[PDB]
């Protein structure tokens, strides 16, 4: 039984949330923000990611060099990432270096210079990032997947933004973005590891008290996406491995079917030929794929956003003449979530998930990430007892009913990259979303 997550607020509406672990000597403090690329329009798309670069380029007090030195002297590191719906800035340090790290984070968020000289310098760095993501195939596949599934909608945009915007982002629009979005009612100060809650609340009162509040404070994790069944093919015969993602519209964080979608995802599960145990996994798709050498790997996913999600699978394969079999067998396993699953698969997946949801949190950064994610998506940290009860509530009838309305005979978004000549056209893929025998 893990220690209780303590939660306090300031007057501006900044949440402070902490989970102490007296067995570790490091601490992760940081700021989770309920804001990301999805808050940009088409003209300033790329701003949030641009800011993340400039946040480390110097503040009104410390210059770029002083900032570098200050963190080096702390002993730990700082890290940041911007996603579609969430931005994070955190600092891992020693137990007693926590007040320094809170002070540095408060500085780079509130008091960053955003000097025209630095904007102009990063404008080239970010331009080079556009031509080097090209190598991270999983990311290429998932960014095309969002672009097509949410065609011409904010969730469909990339985080980097178009080349055109990178050349035209000004310090004005950067400042406007962080003034509109980085407000106290959208922010959570999180501490995990060797942190005292009462100490962290004091540090928040010292550094984050002059944060603007938004005019209309909605609750944390408050959002209309119209999924497009569609396909992107990026054939490249010179690549040896095909990367394929298939997804349907999934569930939001606060859906009533959130746990049902996780259980369904665990029934298919993951596979990787490089792991020794993977040939012995219980999943039917795992057995088909391993016995027939259809794939190097597959990874089921159920990605959630505030108002939508994507549920699907990501496959990698060198077997270029049997891509058709791989896709066929995968979608016939999805069909069985509608037609065939019983208490056998459901109770096995529940067993595996009851542990999996706890196992994931195995270090201070994972704990901080869990507190921050849950506070910015649900407005509260959900206790493991509540999670165990929501999983236990999932029956085989729930899984069948969910799959029948979410998967069965539904449109998919499909992305293929690499030697995908053997991937059939959209209709033949989408025809495997149902079974004529049922």
């Amino acid at each position: 039984v893990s220690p209780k997550t303590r939660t306090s607020n300031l007057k501006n509406g900044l949440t402070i949330a902490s989970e102490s672990n007296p067995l570790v000597q490091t601490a992760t403090v940081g700021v989770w923000i309920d804001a990301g690329s999805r808050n940009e329009n088409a003209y300033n798309n790329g701003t949030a990611h641009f800011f993340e670069h400039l946040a480390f380029k110097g503040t009104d007090k410390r210059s770029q060099h002083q900032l570098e030195l200050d963190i080096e002297n702390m002993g730990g590191h700082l890290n940041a990432y911007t996603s579609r719906e969430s931005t994070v800035y955190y600092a891992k340090s020693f137990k007693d270096d926590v007040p320094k790290s809170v002070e540095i984070l408060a500085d780079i968020l509130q008091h960053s210079k955003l000097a025209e000289s630095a904007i102009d310098r990063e404008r080239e760095v970010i331009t080079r990032e556009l031509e080097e993501v090209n190598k991270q195939y999983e990311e290429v596949v998932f960014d095309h997947l969002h672009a097509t599934a949410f065609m011409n909608q904010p969730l469909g945009r990339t985080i980097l933004g178009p080349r055109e915007n990178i050349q035209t982002i000004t310090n004005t629009e950067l400042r406007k973005f962080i003034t509109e979005n980085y407000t106290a009612d959208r922010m959570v100060l999180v501490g995990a590891g060797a942190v005292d809650h009462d100490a962290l609340v004091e540090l928040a009162e010292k550094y984050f008290s002059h944060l603007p509040s938004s005019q209309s404070p909605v609750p944390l994790g408050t959002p209309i996406p119209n999924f497009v069944g569609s396909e992107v093919r990026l054939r490249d015969d010179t690549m040896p491995v095909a990367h394929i993602a298939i997804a349907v519209e999934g569930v939001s964080w606060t859906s009533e079917d959130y746990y049902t979608a996780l259980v369904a995802q665990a029934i298919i599960g993951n596979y990787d030929r490089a792991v020794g145990t993977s040939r012995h996994q219980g999943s039917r798709l795992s057995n088909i794929v391993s016995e027939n050498n259809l794939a190097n790997s597959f990874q089921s996913f159920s990605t959630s956003y505030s108002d939508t999600g994507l549920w699907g699978i990501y496959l990698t394969s060198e077997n270029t003449t049997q891509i058709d079999d791989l896709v066929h067998f995968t979608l016939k396993e999805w069909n069985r979530l509608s037609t065939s699953v019983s208490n056998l698969q459901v109770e096995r997946a529940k067993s595996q998930l009851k542990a999996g949801l706890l196992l994931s949190l195995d270090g201070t950064t994972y704990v901080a990430e869990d507190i921050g994610r849950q506070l910015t998506t649900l407005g509260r940290r959900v206790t493991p007892a509540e999670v165990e009860a929501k999983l236990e509530a999932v029956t085989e009838h729930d899984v069948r009913a969910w799959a029948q309305k979410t998967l069965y005979d539904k449109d998919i978004a499909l992305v293929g990259l690499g030697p995908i000549e053997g991937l059939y056209d959209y209709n033949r893929i989408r025809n495997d979303m149902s079974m004529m025998r049922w």
């Binding site: 093919r233 490249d236 010179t238 270029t320 998919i412 059939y424 959209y426």
Partner: protein, 85 residues
Amino acid sequence: YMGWWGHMGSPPQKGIAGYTISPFAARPFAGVVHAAIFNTFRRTKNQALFVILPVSFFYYVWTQASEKNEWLYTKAGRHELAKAL
């Protein structure tokens, strides 16, 4: 000269991104009225000579031949028929 899926015999393809949408997401008859009128007119206009010239020529040849044949087997065509045989 033809392989099969996965090794069809194409030269290596690279650099083309292809996009499409589901049959359920699309209007199958989008732009049908424009197509039926303007597209068919364009396609027909561009091929009309290749049909009209041979058809009109061979119809004229037939018409002349059939009218002469008919005339030769009337009373008026007696003499010309006698010579023709």
